[PDB]
Amino acid sequence: FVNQHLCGSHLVEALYLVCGERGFFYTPKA
Amino acid sequence: FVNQHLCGSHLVEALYLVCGERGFFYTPKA
Amino acid sequence: FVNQHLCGSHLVEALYLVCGERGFFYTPKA
Amino acid sequence: FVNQHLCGSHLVEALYLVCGERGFFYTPKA
Amino acid sequence: FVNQHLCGSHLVEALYLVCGERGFFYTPKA
Amino acid sequence: FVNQHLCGSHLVEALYLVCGERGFFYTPKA
Amino acid sequence: GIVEQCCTSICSLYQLENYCN
Amino acid sequence: GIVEQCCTSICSLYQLENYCN
Amino acid sequence: GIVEQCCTSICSLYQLENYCN
Amino acid sequence: GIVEQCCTSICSLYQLENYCN
Amino acid sequence: GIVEQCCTSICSLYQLENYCN
Amino acid sequence: GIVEQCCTSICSLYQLENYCN
Ligand SMILES: [Zn+2]
Ligand SMILES: [Zn+2]
């Protein structure tokens, strides 16, 4: 697998693909 | 606003547009 | 709801989500 | 170009790529 | 990582996130 | 049809729309 | 859940706000 | 309409140009 | 336009509803 | 193919790596 | 490449068809 | 955060799994 710049909605689509059924949390304030 | 039929990654997009920087939790069923 | 920067195709996807069945118009020339 | 089966937000994406800056009107049925 | 049900343009997105700069070949069936 | 700037995943979604069933190749190294 | 309701049935943006942090 | 035809059946990019401003 | 208010500057989901038919 | 398997059934990211250049 | 012609510079939908198999 | 590691800087698909529940 490779490394990339993931910003905005592109970043959460990546989170959806990786986590899938497990679900995930998006906390930019963290 | 109107009612929407959101499935798959289209739902996480909608969450990102509604919550923005506040962040959000995606928790699908087991 | 929050405020954001929406550009390009990301902007029309937002228009689709907000307008839905009502339809919408994208006129950058305006 | 080829024929495509476009539904939901995938249709507005295709409109944005074809019309570009010319803009376009999205008018689904009542 | 988890198993995913990818159709249409959602599959090319997943390919882009996995392959990145390495590039990839999209070859659907005849 | 018009001309535009297509970068990242937006570029491969365009390739999917134009090529469709023919398939395509994304080779940034080229 | 909200994830299932939006896809089997329909949901509103106001319902989706219940999931913002 | 074009919105319904593309989804129930199929449409071409040339048909979609009929909707550009 | 919508681009100067939402892309260059920032806009709310409510401002986007002004472009709905 | 991989394109059909992912959509009719399911596929993993590891299977998709077989298609990177 | 496709990136230098479509991302850095601008390209038409016709130029994108050169990358189709 | 996830934004400073994946957006500002670059991150791998493995680093994204730390944000999965
Ligand atoms: Zn879809
Ligand atoms: Zn983008």
UniProtKB/Swiss-Prot annotation, chains A, B, C, D, E, F:
Domain of life: Eukaryota
Transmembrane intervals: none
Protein name: Insulin B chain
Lineage: Eukaryota, Metazoa, Chordata, Craniata, Vertebrata
Gene name of this polypeptide: INS
Included stretch of the parent chain: 25 to 54 of 108
